[PDB]
Amino acid sequence: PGATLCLGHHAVPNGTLVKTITDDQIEVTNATELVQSSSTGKICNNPHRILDGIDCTLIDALLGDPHCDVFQNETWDLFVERSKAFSNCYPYDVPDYASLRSLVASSGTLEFITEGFTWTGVTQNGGSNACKRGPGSGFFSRLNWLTKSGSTYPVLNVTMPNNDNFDKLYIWGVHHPSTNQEQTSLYVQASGRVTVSTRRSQQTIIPNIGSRPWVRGLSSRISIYWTIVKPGDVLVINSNGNLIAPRGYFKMRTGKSSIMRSDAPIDTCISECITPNGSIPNDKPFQNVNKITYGACPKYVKQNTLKLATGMRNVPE
Amino acid sequence: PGATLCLGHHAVPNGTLVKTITDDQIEVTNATELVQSSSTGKICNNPHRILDGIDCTLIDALLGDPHCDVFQNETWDLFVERSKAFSNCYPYDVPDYASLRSLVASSGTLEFITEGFTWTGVTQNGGSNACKRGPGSGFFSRLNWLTKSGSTYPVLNVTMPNNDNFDKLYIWGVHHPSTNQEQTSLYVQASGRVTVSTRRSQQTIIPNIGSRPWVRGLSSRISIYWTIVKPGDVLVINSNGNLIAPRGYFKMRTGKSSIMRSDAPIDTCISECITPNGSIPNDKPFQNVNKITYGACPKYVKQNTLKLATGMRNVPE
Amino acid sequence: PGATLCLGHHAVPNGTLVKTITDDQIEVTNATELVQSSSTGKICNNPHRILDGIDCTLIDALLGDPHCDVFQNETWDLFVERSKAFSNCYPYDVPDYASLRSLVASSGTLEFITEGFTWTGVTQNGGSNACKRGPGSGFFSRLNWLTKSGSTYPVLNVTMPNNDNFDKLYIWGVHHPSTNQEQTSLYVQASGRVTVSTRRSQQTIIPNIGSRPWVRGLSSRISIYWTIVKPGDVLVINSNGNLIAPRGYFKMRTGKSSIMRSDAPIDTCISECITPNGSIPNDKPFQNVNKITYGACPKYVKQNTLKLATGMRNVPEKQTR
Amino acid sequence: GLFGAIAGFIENGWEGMIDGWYGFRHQNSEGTGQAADLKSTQAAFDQINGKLNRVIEKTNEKFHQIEKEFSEVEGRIQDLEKYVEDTKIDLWSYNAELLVALENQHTIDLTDSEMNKLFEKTGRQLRENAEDMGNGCFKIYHKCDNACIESIRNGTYDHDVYRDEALNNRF
Amino acid sequence: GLFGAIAGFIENGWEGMIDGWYGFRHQNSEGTGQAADLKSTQAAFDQINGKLNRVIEKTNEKFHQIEKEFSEVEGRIQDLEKYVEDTKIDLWSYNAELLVALENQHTIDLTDSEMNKLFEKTGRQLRENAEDMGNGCFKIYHKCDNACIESIRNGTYDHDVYRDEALNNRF
Amino acid sequence: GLFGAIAGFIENGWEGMIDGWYGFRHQNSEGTGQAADLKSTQAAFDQINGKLNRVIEKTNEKFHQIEKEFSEVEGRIQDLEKYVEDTKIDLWSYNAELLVALENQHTIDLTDSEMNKLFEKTGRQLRENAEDMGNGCFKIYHKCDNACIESIRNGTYDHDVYRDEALNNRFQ
Ligand SMILES: *[C@@H]1O[C@H](CO)[C@@H](O[C@@H]2O[C@H](CO)[C@@H](O[C@@H]3O[C@H](CO)[C@@H](O)[C@H](O[C@H]4O[C@H](CO)[C@@H](O)[C@H](O)[C@@H]4O)[C@@H]3O)[C@H](O)[C@H]2NC(C)=O)[C@H](O)[C@H]1NC(C)=O
Ligand SMILES: *[C@@H]1O[C@H](CO)[C@@H](O[C@@H]2O[C@H](CO)[C@@H](O[C@@H]3O[C@H](CO[C@H]4O[C@H](CO)[C@@H](O)[C@H](O)[C@@H]4O)[C@@H](O)[C@H](O)[C@@H]3O)[C@H](O)[C@H]2NC(C)=O)[C@H](O)[C@H]1NC(C)=O
Ligand SMILES: *[C@@H]1O[C@H](CO)[C@@H](O[C@@H]2O[C@H](CO)[C@@H](O[C@@H]3O[C@H](CO)[C@@H](O)[C@H](O)[C@@H]3O)[C@H](O)[C@H]2NC(C)=O)[C@H](O)[C@H]1NC(C)=O
Ligand SMILES: *[C@@H]1O[C@H](CO)[C@@H](O[C@@H]2O[C@H](CO)[C@@H](O[C@@H]3O[C@H](CO)[C@@H](O)[C@H](O)[C@@H]3O)[C@H](O)[C@H]2NC(C)=O)[C@H](O)[C@H]1NC(C)=O
Ligand SMILES: *[C@@H]1O[C@H](CO)[C@@H](O[C@@H]2O[C@H](CO)[C@@H](O)[C@H](O)[C@H]2NC(C)=O)[C@H](O)[C@H]1NC(C)=O
Ligand SMILES: *[C@@H]1O[C@H](CO)[C@@H](O[C@@H]2O[C@H](CO)[C@@H](O)[C@H](O)[C@H]2NC(C)=O)[C@H](O)[C@H]1NC(C)=O
Ligand SMILES: *[C@@H]1O[C@H](CO)[C@@H](O)[C@H](O)[C@H]1NC(C)=O
Ligand SMILES: *[C@@H]1O[C@H](CO)[C@@H](O)[C@H](O)[C@H]1NC(C)=O
Ligand SMILES: *[C@@H]1O[C@H](CO)[C@@H](O)[C@H](O)[C@H]1NC(C)=O
Ligand SMILES: *[C@@H]1O[C@H](CO)[C@@H](O)[C@H](O)[C@H]1NC(C)=O
Ligand SMILES: *[C@@H]1O[C@H](CO)[C@@H](O)[C@H](O)[C@H]1NC(C)=O
Ligand SMILES: *[C@@H]1O[C@H](CO)[C@@H](O)[C@H](O)[C@H]1NC(C)=O
Ligand SMILES: *[C@@H]1O[C@H](CO)[C@@H](O)[C@H](O)[C@H]1NC(C)=O
């Protein structure tokens, strides 16, 4: 009378389905999820510096819309723009809005350095009832609305060299009056012009007179432009009317800063990966939460689940 | 007295060469082709709605070139533009032609809704012998060539609010005369201007007087522009000359519509995948017919053949 | 007494670590490197035609800045722009500089064909002390600075049909004076205009009067524009002032030509693959030298090493040492 | 292949076997014959079919995209459009090349494996009543009529019945 | 799997084995029992753990990128931005799908392999003192008390001790 | 590896074997010796060489592309140019990482496989005249001079010749 010795392996009563080269579904004893498909719904305030825009877009904070004055000294790793943001100053547009927003977002600061531009023979500090400050009319904090002095608006011609070792961002504009009467009344000349240049490039803008839709009492507009001045280069501004002048420059940096559109609330917690839906854990290699991410994030994929087998084939009794 | 029992496998007299990790050519009993390399040469008219442009580009059908009048209000899944297409109306250009074509192609409709614009103090419905409609002078069906009434062309200033729940596309233009004589004769003022705006954006165009080369009898030109007005926004058009006015708006949609350049004939058949060379079967995962495709298509690859082994190693007798 | 027959395999004293599906480091008897991580630091002069820009950008060679005259009619597979390059002619800008540079680089030639434009009633061949050619004033070799003749500058209206079977590239400009005095002195009219058109396109530029930064004695500028004329089309140039006229056209081609920014010296050797750091061998499938490459190159990857196992698992005899 | 049966210890395939992928040839007192093994054939087919169906899983449907041919020279934007597309095509071409190489290596190995599985299954059935000749053949050490051969092929061969007869013939 | 043990010549797994992945069940004069094999279990675990750690190697940190949602229709530049992103997502989705398919096929094959390795190791230990029944079980042809079974399981079974007894019972 | 020979039932490799990758060591009445197996060695080499040549198949040649370094801040277009390139580089870096991992796993498994193939081939040659010791070695149950060993190594060993002698030595 001998003995029997049987070799075998484990099983569980209910395994997990995985995909292979040959099968779309095969049962194994265990698997682990490789796609992150859920969020807390909240943006964690660490370890990245989160700046909540609240009622302000980055561009309104840059220009210095009065309700955005609280952002003047601000820096961020991630600026969060909310769908409730609104503009409440002189009606404006930005040709290439998306680029200006991108480059400021990427710079990560609104650090503004005032420069002593000399505007000879014009009135400075124009304001509007579309952009109220205190009891009176006002304007964008970083822009200087120049108009005639006496009965003349001379050819303005100023220079500002960059002798620093960083890039300077200058924001300026052009005013588009709604009538010929307003044009000549503000700037004397029947047609204005703004030419802003550095050693190797230039932009010339001719204003356009006509009604746009009424916004905060006005059919006129400002168009916003920008110029980067590199170390060793020089800014020249030349205008015989309609110039919305810079007061200085924004000190540019490079680094890890960006901007995101989201309505998720900010919370006190730690998460490396941020999506517009909220922060997500980054222990998994893939995620299906949002193609928009910031930080150390799983890669976006279309699958909502992908199981990595962590055990053998399940062959129950 | 014993027996012999031999285990074995099949072979075939005529195997197929395939590639593996270790061999660029090794013989197996059977294989199947994974790259689609041929087409019928015909575009199947199902299941996608194919609209044959025949003699017309999408843009000419949009503007309403008289020989394209048959396309009024048409819809498509795929608009097919032919190399034989020609323009036969007022000579024009579209700054950012490629974008206008793309956005209309993608919208999938030329559904046009006429609006009651009030053009006070000008002559409407101007026409040209470069753009005949029946025996007499004509113009683009969706545009309204405004010129002086009596001896005056006033400042036009009109509005159209969007109180619908869909986006409106407005197509308009600016006329560029070839001489000062033509300018003042049509528009009185020595220099025109067109400003078209919504609450948030604006375009102002100054016409340019001068000879271009003769096209269909004319050295003058029209430049075509577009403006999208969202629900709750408002269009304002302001001009003291050279305005080529909209008659209404195109209804915008989103969906699966596109455009393709092809000379392949349309046929009555069914195919999910369309290329400029014609429809192709989509049973294979890859194709080498054309990188331009529309529909449920195999992915374009550079290989003209890739064989997937569907049997064992062939070791013949 | 019988016999023992043992089956085995080799081992080596010095194996190499490689990565697998299950192990980030495991020892095999040999491996080979798949990432090219070094360069000679020199660009090989063969088999590609390398044109060293030396002191000149492609655009300065195109316009015909006098110190770039040696590049007239040059051709290249790869134009190499050096960080020492400088401009030394009339101060200028090119709206869409990057595109003009790209399209000329890609065309691979500066072959220029002079055409007999008739400029009635103006002075031709204007020059500047900002753009010396020999001892005296000069200008871009491929551009013609037109100014008043006597006390008039008429409306210029000229044509050049393209009756060839190739595309013509025309480079032209608009002069932006720094004062009204300069404007009327050169062009009579208080405001100029340049309109350049073909059957199907047109560009009108209005000059702008005002100071830009002083460069080589001048606060005025030229802005450079371009127009391609296809076979069967016709160029028309119409101006009542401020036109910087073309003298002809550049022949356009298509092919394998490009441009690269590099300070590596050019040397006598053969290499299919060029990077800004120098040529690299292309025997390996990957490289970590530079994402900027030209020619038959390994693909750029972030890893600086990747080892492909070329032998079995290395299993030495364990020792009690 | 990894298992060393097909193109290995089995010298070659049988062109005459047209009703299966794997099977048996025998020689006994009653003559010679051939029969396909359905189970092993089916297992190979099911795996190859499974991978075929995974590979032809229709996965992309695209509508409006970017332009990919251009009638004019434009510079920067067009350079980028062409580069984006060329980059995509090279990556998918790589994916396709790798896919077929991996699939094909594996198909060759799984078919080799099924041959080997059938061989070891047969050997185990025969217990001590046969010896492995080393060329894919078993020398069976007893009288094995056509009933006995079919018993081995359809999995009902009782080795105890013939063990004494076979053990004697071997030793 | 490629080795034909798991879901193969071993009919099914043991739900009762909760202290290891592979192991032994025996019947002798003293009754029946079960014991996990640590070494084979450990080898499977180490390989699976190794691949898990390779797959979750954190590799991706991105800051400012491109916009991927747009509130306005723009045409050409936006078409390209969307196409670039859609292209990227499809390629990474493909990579993810292929990765899991290859990993999973391999995990099933390596676990099947470890079962087979343990089975062949045991068979080799037993030399001429046992026969392979064909269902993952060895008929041991001698008295094998619980000490003798443990000797086989912990790798110290001396086959010479029982060879005469076993050879006699077999032949 | 999958086959459990290399780093498995074979305890270790032989540093002394310098003329092949796989082979034989024997002990008989006449002493001890070592000989490389050419066939198995050649099969491993051919497969590894085959995969090497597939991997270094030169496939890409690019001329004018996009710019990848920028001396000015520009915004949207430059963001897209950089993103396109960064996307490409990450995907190719992934491809390279995966390629080597899969190739290397397979190289280890194919070499393990060839060891195993040689072992099973030898075992089959010996029929009933030898037993598997379990460490990669066969105890041969008969007198096997150097001629007899070479007969096994070059595939000409006739097992019938020694079967009676061997069967007697094995069973009592
Ligand atoms: C609009 O405003 C700008 C800024 O104020 C102004 O441009 C400036 O003009 C002056 C005079 O042309 C430039 O001064 C030159 O600078 C360089 C050094 O970089 C020197 O080489 C020059 O010196 C020589 O030449 C002088 C003769 O003019 C001699 O007096 C001197 O001894 C030297 O030989 C000269 O100083 C200055 O560089 C520019 N600055 C900029 C940033 O452009 C422009 O003139 C104003 N426009 C009008 C119409 O007033
Ligand atoms: C050129 O034509 C333009 C279009 O007609 C003219 O613009 C119009 O100008 C008038 C004032 O002159 C504006 O009227 C004011 O509108 C606001 C309210 O605006 C909207 O909001 C309320 C709800 O809050 C809504 O009920 C209204 O319908 C408006 O939609 C009132 O509060 C004021 O009291 C006053 O009525 C028009 O809004 C404005 N329309 C547009 C679309 O801009 C322009 O005046 C003309 N210019 C010239 C030089 O002739
Ligand atoms: C400025 O120069 C351009 C180019 O030379 C002039 O355009 C030309 O204008 C004439 C008529 O004034 C066109 O002639 C016409 O040709 C057709 C046949 O093609 C003929 O049937 C008509 O009867 C007529 O003669 C000519 O085609 C046109 N040339 C081009 C190339 O477009 C332009 O008129 C000049 N303007 C001034 C004010 O000098
Ligand atoms: C183990 O792998 C390494 C590769 O990682 C092998 O080294 C390479 O072997 C040969 C020398 O036999 C070298 O290639 C030759 O180079 C000379 C000039 O350098 C050339 O004239 C020949 O035509 C040939 O290309 C190669 O440089 C060398 N590479 C390195 C990095 O060492 C080695 O051969 C392998 N060892 C074994 C035992 O297989
Ligand atoms: C589908 O149409 C394309 C576009 O015409 C064909 O590609 C051309 O044909 C040959 C080789 O393919 C080349 O000389 C041309 O330069 C190609 N043009 C382009 C834009 O690639 C293609 O051959 C057609 N394919 C089939 C299967 O009909
Ligand atoms: C080739 O040149 C590139 C850049 O010209 C070198 O990349 C730099 O490497 C250092 C680290 O040594 C980094 O800090 C810089 O960020 C890199 N610069 C850029 C512009 O990428 C690269 O090292 C060179 N490679 C070789 C082999 O010489
Ligand atoms: C299943 O897999 C995970 C991932 O390795 C592991 O941590 C967990 O303990 C496993 N669960 C069981 C029941 O084995
Ligand atoms: C910014 O900083 C200055 C100087 O420290 C301070 O006086 C001012 O109030 C700050 N502005 C805001 C909006 O906090
Ligand atoms: C995240 O937000 C996107 C965009 O609004 C939405 O479509 C998606 O379903 C959300 N996903 C999760 C997991 O919340
Ligand atoms: C290859 O594929 C199918 C079976 O799936 C069959 O019709 C064809 O004849 C096969 N060819 C060979 C040579 O087996
Ligand atoms: C176009 O749109 C609608 C039809 O739904 C209608 O208002 C209009 O008359 C149509 N015109 C034509 C020509 O079909
Ligand atoms: C440039 O080439 C053209 C035509 O091929 C020729 O007429 C001209 O003289 C050449 N100029 C130089 C400087 O080589
Ligand atoms: C299997 O083979 C035998 C012998 O030919 C046959 O008679 C029998 O019907 C078959 N199987 C079963 C389960 O009866």
Domain boundaries, chain F: 1-172
Q: Dihedral angle at the C-alpha atoms of A270, A275, A277, A281, nearest 10 degrees?
A: -50
Residue B35 to residue D99: CA distance in whole angstroms: 13
Q: Does the distance separating the beta carbons of D2 and F113 come in below 8 Å?
A: yes
The helix-helix angle for D76-126 and E76-126 (nearest 10°) equals 20
**For the CA of A110, the nearest ligand:** 8
**For the CA of A232, the nearest ligand:** 1
Q: Dihedral angle at the C-alpha atoms of A103, A104, A107, A110, nearest 10 degrees?
A: 160
Using a 10 angstrom Cβ sphere, with 0-12 exposed, 13-18 middle and 19 or more buried, the burial of residue D106 is buried
Nearest CA among B166, B160, B155, B159 for reference residue B111: B166
Are A238 and A160 within 8 A, CB to CB?
Answer: no
Helix (H, G, I), strand (E, B) or coil at F82: helix
Are C186 and C147 within 8 A, CB to CB?
Answer: yes
- Residues 6+ away with beta carbon under 8 Å from C316: C11, C13, F12, F13, F15
- Residues 6+ away with beta carbon under 8 Å from E117: E40, E43, F4, F8
Are B129 and D98 within 8 A, CB to CB?
Answer: no
Mutate to test the pocket of ligand 2, among B117, B195, B236 (most ligand atoms within 8 A of CB): B236
- CB atoms inside a 10 Å sphere around CB C124: 13
**Architecture in CATH of D1-171:** Alpha-Beta Complex (3.90)
Region of residue B278 (left: phi > 0; alpha: psi -120 to 50; beta: else): left
Shortest CA distance from C302: residue in chain F: F93
Query: Which residues pair with residue A244 across a beta bridge?
Result: A145, A173
Are C27 and C16 within 8 A, CB to CB?
Answer: yes
Are A176 and A145 within 8 A, CB to CB?
Answer: no
Region of residue F157 (left: phi > 0; alpha: psi -120 to 50; beta: else): beta
Are A36 and A50 within 8 A, CB to CB?
Answer: no
Shortest CA distance from A91: residue in chain B: B200
Residue C9 to residue A55: CA distance in whole angstroms: 73
**What are residue F54's phi and psi, to 5 degrees?**
-65, -45
Question: Contact partners of A by the rule of 3+ C-beta pairs under 8 A?
Answer: B, C, D, E, F
Cα-Cα end-to-end distance for chain D: 35
Query: Which residues pair with residue B279 across a beta bridge?
Result: B274
How far does the centroid of ligand 9 lie from the alpha carbon of residue E69, in Å?
12
Q: Is B134 in the pocket of ligand 3 (CB under 6 A)?
A: no
How far does the centroid of ligand 6 lie from the alpha carbon of residue C301, in Å?
13
- CB atoms inside a 10 Å sphere around CB F53: 12
- CB atoms inside a 10 Å sphere around CB C129: 11
The conformation of residue C317, written as its DSSP 8-state character, comes to P
CA count, 13 A, side-chain hemisphere, B41? 0
Residue C236: C-alpha distances to residues B93, C159, C227, F69, F152 (Å): 16, 5, 11, 38, 93
**What are residue E143's phi and psi, to 5 degrees?**
-65, 125
Are C197 and C236 within 8 A, CB to CB?
Answer: yes
Q: Does the distance separating the beta carbons of F113 and D134 come in below 8 Å?
A: no
Residue A215: C-alpha distances to residues A69, A212, A242, B194, B230 (Å): 21, 9, 20, 20, 16
The conformation of residue C48, written as its DSSP 8-state character, comes to S
Helices (H), chain E: 38-55, 76-126, 146-153, 159-170
Name the residue at shortest CA distance from atom 1 of ligand 6.
C277
Give the DSSP H or E segment for A213. Answer: none
How far does the centroid of ligand 5 lie from the alpha carbon of residue B279, in Å?
15
Which amino acid is residue A76, in one-letter code? Answer: W
Nearest CA among B263, B280, B283, B262 for reference residue B271: B280
Q: Which two tokens stand for residue D29?
A: 């007192």
Q: Does the distance separating the beta carbons of B236 and A213 come in below 8 Å?
A: yes
User: From the list C98, C167, C252, which residue is nearest D76 (CB)?
Assistant: C98
Residue A101: C-alpha distances to residues A57, A285, B199, E52, E55 (Å): 9, 31, 20, 41, 37
Query: Which residues pair with residue C248 across a beta bridge?
Result: C114
Are B24 and F56 within 8 A, CB to CB?
Answer: no
Residue A228: C-alpha distances to residues A169, A203, D99, E152 (Å): 5, 12, 49, 80
Are B160 and B117 within 8 A, CB to CB?
Answer: yes
Cα-Cα end-to-end distance for chain F: 38
Q: Is C290 in the pocket of ligand 6 (CB under 6 A)?
A: yes
Q: Which two tokens stand for residue A17?
A: 């389905």
Residue A269: C-alpha distances to residues A45, A77, F144 (Å): 6, 16, 77
Query: Which residues pair with residue B195 across a beta bridge?
Result: B204, B238
Residue D146 to residue C89: CA distance in whole angstroms: 103
Are B13 and B264 within 8 A, CB to CB?
Answer: no
Interface B-E: count of C-beta contacts within 8 A: 19
Q: Give just the sign of the alpha carbon dihedral F158, F160, F166, F171.
A: positive
- A7 contact residues in E (CB cutoff 8 A): 10, 22-24, 115, 118-119, 122, 136-138
Are B64 and B245 within 8 A, CB to CB?
Answer: no
Which atom belonging to ligand 11 lies closest to the Cα atom of B114?
A: 7
Q: Does E2 touch chain D (CB under 8 A)?
A: yes
Strand ranges in chain F using DSSP code E only, listed in sequence order: 22-28, 31-36, 61-62, 130-132, 137-140
Q: Which two tokens stand for residue B61?
A: 């059908």
Residue C96 to residue D75: CA distance in whole angstroms: 9
- CB atoms inside a 10 Å sphere around CB A50: 18
Residue reference for tokens 């204003």: A207
- Residues 6+ away with beta carbon under 8 Å from B272: B47, B282, B295, B296, B297, D61
Task: Give this entry's resolution in angstroms.
Answer: 2.1
Q: Which two tokens stand for residue A38?
A: 């859920």
Angle, CA of F89, F105 and A21, to the nearest 5°: 80
Nearest CA among B279, B313, B312 for reference residue B297: B279
| Contacts for E161-170: CB closer than 8 Å, 24+ residues apart | E162/E129, E163/E127, E163/E128, E163/E129, E164/F172, E165/E141, E166/E128, E166/E129, E166/E130, E166/E140, E166/E141, E166/E142, E167/E128, E167/E129, E167/E141, E167/F171, E167/F172, E169/A2, E169/E141, E169/E142, E170/D128, E170/E128, E170/E131, E170/E141
Residue B290 to residue A174: CA distance in whole angstroms: 48
Which atom belonging to ligand 8 lies closest to the Cα atom of A73?
A: 1
Are A212 and A91 within 8 A, CB to CB?
Answer: yes
Rg (C-alpha) for chain F, rounded Å, is 27
Q: Does the distance separating the beta carbons of A10 and E21 come in below 8 Å?
A: yes
Q: Which positions 220-239 of A are in contact with B (Cβ < 8 Å)?
A: 221, 223
Give the DSSP H or E segment for F125. Answer: helix F76-126
The conformation of residue A66, written as its DSSP 8-state character, comes to G
Are F56 and C283 within 8 A, CB to CB?
Answer: yes
Give the β-pairing of C35-36 and C286-287: parallel
Classify domain A49-264 by CATH number: 3.90.209.20
Residue A243 to residue B14: CA distance in whole angstroms: 82
Residue reference for tokens 């009317």: A241
Are B170 and B226 within 8 A, CB to CB?
Answer: yes
Are C308 and F55 within 8 A, CB to CB?
Answer: yes
Nearest CA among F79, A54, B55 for reference residue E68: F79
| Contacts for C271-277: CB closer than 8 Å, 24+ residues apart | C271/C44, C271/C46, C271/C295, C272/C47, C272/C296, C272/C297, C272/F61, C273/C297, C273/C298, C274/C43, C274/C44, C274/C48, C274/C50, C274/C78, C275/C39, C277/C39, C277/C41
- CB atoms inside a 10 Å sphere around CB B14: 9
Residue B195 to residue B202: CA distance in whole angstroms: 7
Angle, CA of C102, C108 and C110, to the nearest 5°: 95
Helix (H, G, I), strand (E, B) or coil at A114: strand
Are A85 and A57 within 8 A, CB to CB?
Answer: yes
Give the DSSP H or E segment for F47. Answer: helix F38-55
Are C59 and C100 within 8 A, CB to CB?
Answer: yes
- Strand-by-strand arrangement of the C299-300 sheet: C35-36, C286-287, C299-300
Burial B47-57 (b: 16+ CB within 10 A, else e): ebebbbbebbb
Q: Which two tokens stand for residue B266?
A: 């349309």
Residue reference for tokens 């290249």: C76
Determination technique for this PDB entry? Answer: X-ray
Q: Distance, in angstroms, between A130 CA and closest chain E CA?
A: 26
Helix (H, G, I), strand (E, B) or coil at C168: strand
Residue D30 to residue A147: CA distance in whole angstroms: 118
Q: Distance, in angstroms, between E99 CA and closest chain B CA?
A: 17
Which atom belonging to ligand 2 lies closest to the Cα atom of A213?
A: 43
Q: Which two tokens stand for residue A37?
A: 């498909």
- Residues 6+ away with beta carbon under 8 Å from A29: A10, A11, A12, A15, A16, A311, A312, A313, A314, E13
Q: Which two tokens stand for residue C291?
A: 């994402």
Helices (H), chain C: 58-63, 97-107, 180-187
Classify domain F1-172 by CATH number: 3.90.20.10
The helix-helix angle for F76-126 and D76-126 (nearest 10°) equals 20
Nearest CA among C20, E13, B24 for reference residue F98: C20
Q: Does the distance separating the beta carbons of E53 and C21 come in below 8 Å?
A: no
Residue D153 to residue B35: CA distance in whole angstroms: 41
Burial D81-98 (b: 16+ CB within 10 A, else e): bbbbbebbbbbbbbbbbb
Helix (H, G, I), strand (E, B) or coil at B245: strand
Are D72 and B93 within 8 A, CB to CB?
Answer: no
Residue B51 to residue B71: CA distance in whole angstroms: 9
- D116 contact residues in E (CB cutoff 8 A): 4
